[PDB]
mmCIF file of C-alpha atoms in Angstrom:
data_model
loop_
_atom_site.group_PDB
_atom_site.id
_atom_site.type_symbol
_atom_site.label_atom_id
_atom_site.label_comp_id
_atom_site.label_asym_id
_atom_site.label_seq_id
_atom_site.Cartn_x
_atom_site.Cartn_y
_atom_site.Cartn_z
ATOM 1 C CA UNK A 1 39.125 94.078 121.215
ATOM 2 C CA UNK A 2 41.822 92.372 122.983
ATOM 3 C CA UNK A 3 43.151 93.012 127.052
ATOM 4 C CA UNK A 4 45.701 92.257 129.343
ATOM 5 C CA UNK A 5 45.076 91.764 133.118
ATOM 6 C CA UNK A 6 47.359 93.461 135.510
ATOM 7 C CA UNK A 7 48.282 93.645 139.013
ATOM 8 C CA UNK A 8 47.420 97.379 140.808
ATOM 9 C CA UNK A 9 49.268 99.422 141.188
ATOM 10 C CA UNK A 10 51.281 98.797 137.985
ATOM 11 C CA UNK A 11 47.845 98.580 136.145
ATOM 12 C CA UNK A 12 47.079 102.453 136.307
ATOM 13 C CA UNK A 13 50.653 102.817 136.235
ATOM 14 C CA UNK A 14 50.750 101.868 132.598
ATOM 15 C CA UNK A 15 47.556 103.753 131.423
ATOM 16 C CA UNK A 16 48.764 106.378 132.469
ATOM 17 C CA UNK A 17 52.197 106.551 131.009
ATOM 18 C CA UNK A 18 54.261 106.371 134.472
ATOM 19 C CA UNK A 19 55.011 102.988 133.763
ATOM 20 C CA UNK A 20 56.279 102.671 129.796
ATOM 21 C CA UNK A 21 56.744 98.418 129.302
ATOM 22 C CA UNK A 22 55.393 95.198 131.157
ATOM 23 C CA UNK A 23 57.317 92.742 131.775
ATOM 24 C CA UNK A 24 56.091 88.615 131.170
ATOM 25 C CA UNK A 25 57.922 84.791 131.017
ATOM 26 C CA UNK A 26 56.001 84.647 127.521
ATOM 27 C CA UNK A 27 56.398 86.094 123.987
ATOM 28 C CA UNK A 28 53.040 87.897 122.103
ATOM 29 C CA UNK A 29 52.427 88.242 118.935
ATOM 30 C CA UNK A 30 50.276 91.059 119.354
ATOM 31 C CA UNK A 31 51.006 94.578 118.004
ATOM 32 C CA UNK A 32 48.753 97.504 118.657
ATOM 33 C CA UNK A 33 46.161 98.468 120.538
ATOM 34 C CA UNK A 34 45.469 96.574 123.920
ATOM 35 C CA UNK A 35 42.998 96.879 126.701
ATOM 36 C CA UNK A 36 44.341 97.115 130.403
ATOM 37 C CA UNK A 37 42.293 95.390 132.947
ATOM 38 C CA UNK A 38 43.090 95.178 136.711
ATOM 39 C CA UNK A 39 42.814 92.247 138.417
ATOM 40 C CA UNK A 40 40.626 91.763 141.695
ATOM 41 C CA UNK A 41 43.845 91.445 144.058
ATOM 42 C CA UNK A 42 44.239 94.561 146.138
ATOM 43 C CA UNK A 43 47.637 95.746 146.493
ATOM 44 C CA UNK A 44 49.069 96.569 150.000
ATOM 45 C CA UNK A 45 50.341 99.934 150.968
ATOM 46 C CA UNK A 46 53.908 98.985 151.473
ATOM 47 C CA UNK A 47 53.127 98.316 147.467
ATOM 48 C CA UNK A 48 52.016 101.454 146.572
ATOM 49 C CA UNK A 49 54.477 103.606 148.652
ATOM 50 C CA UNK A 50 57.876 101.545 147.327
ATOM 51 C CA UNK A 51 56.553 101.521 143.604
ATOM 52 C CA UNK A 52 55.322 105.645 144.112
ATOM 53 C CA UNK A 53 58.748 105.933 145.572
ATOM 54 C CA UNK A 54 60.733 104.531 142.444
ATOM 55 C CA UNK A 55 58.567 106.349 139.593
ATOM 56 C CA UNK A 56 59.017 109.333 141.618
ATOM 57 C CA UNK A 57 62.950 109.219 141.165
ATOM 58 C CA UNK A 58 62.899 108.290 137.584
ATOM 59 C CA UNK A 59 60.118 110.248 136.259
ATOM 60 C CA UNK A 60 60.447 113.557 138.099
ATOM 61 C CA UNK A 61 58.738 116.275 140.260
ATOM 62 C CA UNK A 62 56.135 116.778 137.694
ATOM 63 C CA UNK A 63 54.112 112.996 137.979
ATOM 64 C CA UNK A 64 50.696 112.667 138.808
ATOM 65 C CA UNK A 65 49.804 109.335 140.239
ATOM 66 C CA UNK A 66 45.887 108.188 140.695
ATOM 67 C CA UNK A 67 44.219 109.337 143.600
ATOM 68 C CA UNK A 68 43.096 105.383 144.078
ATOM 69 C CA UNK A 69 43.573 102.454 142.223
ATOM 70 C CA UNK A 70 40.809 100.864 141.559
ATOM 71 C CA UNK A 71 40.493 97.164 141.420
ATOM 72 C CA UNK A 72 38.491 94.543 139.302
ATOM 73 C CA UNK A 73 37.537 96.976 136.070
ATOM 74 C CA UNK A 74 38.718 97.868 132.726
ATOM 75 C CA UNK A 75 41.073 100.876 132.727
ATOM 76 C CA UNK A 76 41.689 102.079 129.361
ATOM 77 C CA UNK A 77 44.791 100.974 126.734
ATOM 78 C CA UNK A 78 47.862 101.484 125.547
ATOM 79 C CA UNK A 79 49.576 100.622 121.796
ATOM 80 C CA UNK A 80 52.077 97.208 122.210
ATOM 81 C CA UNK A 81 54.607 98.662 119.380
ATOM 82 C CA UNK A 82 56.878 95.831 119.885
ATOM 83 C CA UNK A 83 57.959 92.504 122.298
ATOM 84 C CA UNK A 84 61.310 92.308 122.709
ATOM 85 C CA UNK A 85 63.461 89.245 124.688
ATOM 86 C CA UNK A 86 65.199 90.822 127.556
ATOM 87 C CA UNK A 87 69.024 90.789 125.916
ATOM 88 C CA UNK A 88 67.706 92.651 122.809
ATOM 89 C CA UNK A 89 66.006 95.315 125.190
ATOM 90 C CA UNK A 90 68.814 95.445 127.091
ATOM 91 C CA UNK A 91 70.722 95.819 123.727
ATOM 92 C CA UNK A 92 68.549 98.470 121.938
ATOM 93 C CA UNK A 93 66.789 100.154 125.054
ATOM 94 C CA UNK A 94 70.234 100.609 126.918
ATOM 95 C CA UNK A 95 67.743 104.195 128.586
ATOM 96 C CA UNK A 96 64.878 102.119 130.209
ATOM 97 C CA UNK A 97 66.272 98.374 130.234
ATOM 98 C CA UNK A 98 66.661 98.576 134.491
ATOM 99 C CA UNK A 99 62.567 99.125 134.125
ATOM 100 C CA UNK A 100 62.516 95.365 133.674
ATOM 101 C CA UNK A 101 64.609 92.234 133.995
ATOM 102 C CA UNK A 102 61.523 90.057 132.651
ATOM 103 C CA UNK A 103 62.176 87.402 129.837
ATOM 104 C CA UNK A 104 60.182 89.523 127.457
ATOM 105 C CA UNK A 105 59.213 93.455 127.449
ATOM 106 C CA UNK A 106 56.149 94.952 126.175
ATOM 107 C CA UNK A 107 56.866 98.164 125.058
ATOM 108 C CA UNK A 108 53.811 100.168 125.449
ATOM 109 C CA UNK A 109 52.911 103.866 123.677
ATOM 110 C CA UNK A 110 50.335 105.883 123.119
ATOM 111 C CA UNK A 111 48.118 105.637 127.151
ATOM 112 C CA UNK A 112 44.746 106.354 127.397
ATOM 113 C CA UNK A 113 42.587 105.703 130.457
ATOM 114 C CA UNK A 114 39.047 105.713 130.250
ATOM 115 C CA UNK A 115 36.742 108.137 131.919
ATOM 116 C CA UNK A 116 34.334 105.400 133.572
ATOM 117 C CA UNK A 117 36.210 102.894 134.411
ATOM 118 C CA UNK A 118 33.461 99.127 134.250
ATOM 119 C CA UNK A 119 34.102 95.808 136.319
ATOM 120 C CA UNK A 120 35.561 92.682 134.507
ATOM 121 C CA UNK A 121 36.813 89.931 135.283
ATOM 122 C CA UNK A 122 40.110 88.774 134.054
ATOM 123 C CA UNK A 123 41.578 85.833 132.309
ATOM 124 C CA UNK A 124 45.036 84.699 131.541
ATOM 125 C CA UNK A 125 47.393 86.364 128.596
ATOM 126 C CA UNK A 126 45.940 88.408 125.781
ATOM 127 C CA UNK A 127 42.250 87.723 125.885
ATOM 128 C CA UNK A 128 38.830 88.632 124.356
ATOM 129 C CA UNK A 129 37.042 91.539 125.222
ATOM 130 C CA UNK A 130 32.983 90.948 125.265
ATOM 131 C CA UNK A 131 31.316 93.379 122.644
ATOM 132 C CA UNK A 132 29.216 95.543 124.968
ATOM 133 C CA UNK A 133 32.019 96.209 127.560
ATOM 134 C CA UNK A 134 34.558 96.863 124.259
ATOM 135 C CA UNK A 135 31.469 99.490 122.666
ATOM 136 C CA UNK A 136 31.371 101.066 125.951
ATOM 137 C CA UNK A 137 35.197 101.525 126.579
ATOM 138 C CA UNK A 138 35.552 102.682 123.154
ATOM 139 C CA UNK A 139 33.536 105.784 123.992
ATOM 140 C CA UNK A 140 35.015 106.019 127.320
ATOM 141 C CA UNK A 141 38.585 107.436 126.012
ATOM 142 C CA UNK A 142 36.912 110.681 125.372
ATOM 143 C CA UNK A 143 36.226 112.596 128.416
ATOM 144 C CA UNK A 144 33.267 114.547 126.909
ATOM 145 C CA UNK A 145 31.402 111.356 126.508
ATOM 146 C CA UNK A 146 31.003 110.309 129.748
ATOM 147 C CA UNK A 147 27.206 109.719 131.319
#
């Protein structure tokens, strides 16, 4: 019941496992599962090609970025397993800690994107999702159910 806004492209980035944490200034409480929303601001090419240039080197041959990235709309979620402050990541996580110099790290399992994806609009840190929108993505992270 409760979402994140993001920035495109890192927004499909993490719902679809290419990116793995997210990086804030501020510590959650939260644990589990967590709705990704983009935000309306478009990102520029120059963007896209320098951040599909990075995950390319670290991930491998074998990714599959989106086609597009869509702005403004719910994308699907991910599981926030823990929030760490950047010296214990960079402590425990010595594999991923370049992934993000940010205060705290989000680490994020378990992507799933949603098959339609439905405009929102955003609000700051860990908010509310509105019941209809949250019944609607909940059948949305099977790809059978779409309609």
């Amino acid at each position: 019941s409760w979402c994140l806004s993001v920035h495109q492209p890192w927004a499909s980035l993490l719902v679809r496992g290419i990116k793995r944490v997210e990086g804030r200034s501020w510590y959650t409480p939260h644990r589990g599962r967590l709705w990704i929303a983009a935000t309306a601001k478009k990102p520029s090419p120059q963007e896209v090609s320098e951040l599909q240039a990075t995950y390319r080197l670290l991930r491998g041959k074998d990714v599959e970025f989106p086609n597009d990235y869509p702005s403004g709309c719910l994308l699907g979620c991910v599981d926030l397993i823990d929030c760490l402050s950047q010296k214990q990541f960079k402590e425990q996580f010595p594999d991923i800690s370049q992934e993000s110099d940010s205060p705290f790290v989000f680490i994020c399992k378990n992507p799933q994107e949603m098959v339609v994806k439905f405009p929102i609009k955003g609000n700051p840190k860990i908010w509310k999702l509105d019941s209809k929108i949250h019944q609607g993505a909940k059948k949305g992270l099977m790809k059978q159910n779409k309609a």
